Structure 1
Amino acid sequence: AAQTNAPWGLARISSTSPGTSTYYYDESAGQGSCVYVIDTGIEASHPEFEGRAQMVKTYYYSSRDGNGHGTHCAGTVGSRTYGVAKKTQLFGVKVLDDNGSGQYSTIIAGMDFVASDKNNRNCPKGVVASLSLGGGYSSSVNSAAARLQSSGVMVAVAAGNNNADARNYSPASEPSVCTVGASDRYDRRSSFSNYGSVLDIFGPGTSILSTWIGGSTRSISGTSMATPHVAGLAAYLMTLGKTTAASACRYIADTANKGDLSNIPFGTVNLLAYNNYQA
């Protein structure tokens, strides 16, 4: 399948070169997989989700996304126009309030929730969790992300936006989950992106167009935006039977575009998510 005039990040993930604008993908499109977006929520009524999104949990007075960030990230995972895996089921878990904040105890509860909740969902092709959130190092936050992964969920997490080594942030610094840095449309490391040995992969993170609340759309930037490209890619590759939740981060690294990014610091991986789709 070919989507013309796609957001640049979608085009980049199915291309061997920057500077193209058509996104190419197998029509299976993550059908039969699920992705949890653990964030400020998801505006499930957005036409872009086509009925494939739903809120499954909140820790606050409402499951509504009153921010937009969770909706934007879900849209990069799975919206019809802005998404990587255009037929995945999206589940929203609102661990962050409408100011984008959340206590680590709530974040942890949300991760453990997803590890159990997948057993109440139909995801025969596999389950992914996208975590576009983070703060300072916490062994407890890392342990939670490690249990979620261990339970059979492909966990993708933001490296962080500090232009710093991600070893000092959580769940970024957890070795067993997929830690995602951000790039721009010219294959430069995004200027805010964290880096370091704990990074596993980069995805598109600067100037990313996706869904927003009030049935709208917006372009914003962050390792928050790179993470759901990877999450959507993993769901798409699991539906194709190419990988599994346990192996998807390795598989994405194995199949990435290599050595193509600039301003990657010595000792950080130079690997850009790529779907290796041959139309």
Structure 2
Amino acid sequence: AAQTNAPWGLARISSTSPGTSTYYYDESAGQGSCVYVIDTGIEASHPEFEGRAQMVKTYYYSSRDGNGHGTHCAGTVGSRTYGVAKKTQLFGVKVLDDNGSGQYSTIIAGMDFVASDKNNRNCPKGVVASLSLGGGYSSSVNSAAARLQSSGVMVAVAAGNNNADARNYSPASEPSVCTVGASDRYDRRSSFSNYGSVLDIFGPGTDILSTWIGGSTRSISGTSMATPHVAGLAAYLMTLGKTTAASACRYIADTANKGDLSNIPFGTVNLLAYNNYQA
């Protein structure tokens, strides 16, 4: 299948070179997989989700996304127009308030929830979790991310946006999960992207068009936007039977575009998420 005039990021992940505008993907499109977006919520009623999205848990007064951030990330995972895995099932877990912040204790609770909840869902091709959030180092937070991964969920997390070594941020610094850096449409490391030996992979993160609240769309930038590209890719590959939750991050790294990125400091991987599609 081919989506013409696609968002640049979707084009980038199905191409060996920058500057193309068609997203090439197998028609299976993540069907039978499930992705938990742990964030500000998801506006499930947005037409772009086609009824494939639902809120399953909130830690605040309502389950609505009053912010936009969660809806944007979810769109990049699995909306029709803006998503990597266009037929996946999306589940929303609201651990961030409508200002986009949340206590570590709540974020941990949301991760433990997913490890359990997945056992009540029909996700025959596997389960992914996308975490476009983080803060200062906490061994508790890292440990929660490690538990979620260990339970058989592919965990993808943002490297963070401090233009610094991700070793000082959580859950970015947990080695066992898939830590995602950001690139721009010219194959530069995004100027804000964290780096360091703990990064596993890069994805598109500068000027990413996706869904927003009020049934709208907008472009924003962040390692928050790169993470769902990788989460979406994992769900897509699991559906095709190429990898499993336990080994998806390693498979994505092994099959990536290598050496394409500029402004990567010594000690940081030069690996860009790639779907290897051949028609």
TM-score, L = length of structure 1: 1.00
Hey, what's the Cα distance between the residues in 1 that align with 2:202 and 2:121?
Answer: 29
SS at match of 2:161: coil
**How far does residue 227 in structure 1 lie from its aligned partner after superposition?**
0.1
**How far does residue 98 in structure 1 lie from its aligned partner after superposition?**
0.2
SS at match of 2:112: helix
**How far does residue 252 in structure 1 lie from its aligned partner after superposition?**
0.2
Hey, what's the Cα distance between the residues in 2 that align with 1:21 and 1:38?
Answer: 29
Task: Give per-residue Cα distances to partners, 1:22-48, cap 9 Å, x unaligned.
Answer: 000000000000000000000000000
Hey, what's the Cα distance between the residues in 1 that align with 2:157 and 2:16?
Answer: 24
Hey, what's the Cα distance between the residues in 2 that align with 1:264 and 1:121?
Answer: 40
Task: Give per-residue Cα distances to partners, 1:47-97, cap 9 Å, x unaligned.
Answer: 000000000000000000000000000000000000000000000000000
**How far does residue 158 in structure 1 lie from its aligned partner after superposition?**
0.0
**How far does residue 101 in structure 1 lie from its aligned partner after superposition?**
0.1
Tell me the equivalent position of 2:77: 77
- Runs of 4+ in structure 1 displaced over 2 angstroms? none
Tell me the equivalent position of 1:258: 258
Over the residues paired in the alignment, what is the CA RMSD in angstroms?
Answer: 0.2
Matches within 5 A, 1:1-279: 1-279=1-279
SS at match of 1:181: strand
Gaps of 5+ in 1: none
Task: Give per-residue Cα distances to partners, 1:1-41, cap 9 Å, x unaligned.
Answer: 00000000000000000000000000000000000000000
**How far does residue 155 in structure 1 lie from its aligned partner after superposition?**
0.1
**How far does residue 131 in structure 1 lie from its aligned partner after superposition?**
0.1
Hey, what's the Cα distance between the residues in 2 that align with 1:227 and 1:47?
Answer: 23
Task: Give per-residue Cα distances to partners, 1:140-183, cap 9 Å, x unaligned.
Answer: 00000000000000000000000000000000000000000000
Hey, what's the Cα distance between the residues in 2 that align with 1:170 and 1:73?
Answer: 19
Task: Give per-residue Cα distances to partners, 1:101-150, cap 9 Å, x unaligned.
Answer: 00000000000000000001110000000000000000000000000000
Give the fraction of aligned pairs with identical amino acids, expressed as a percent: 100
Gaps of 5+ in 2: none
SS at match of 2:17: coil
Hey, what's the Cα distance between the residues in 1 that align with 2:43 and 2:249?
Answer: 28
SS at match of 1:190: coil
**How far does residue 271 in structure 1 lie from its aligned partner after superposition?**
0.1
SS at match of 1:203: strand
SS at match of 2:36: strand
The number of residue pairs the alignment matches comes to 279
TM-score, L = length of structure 2: 1.00
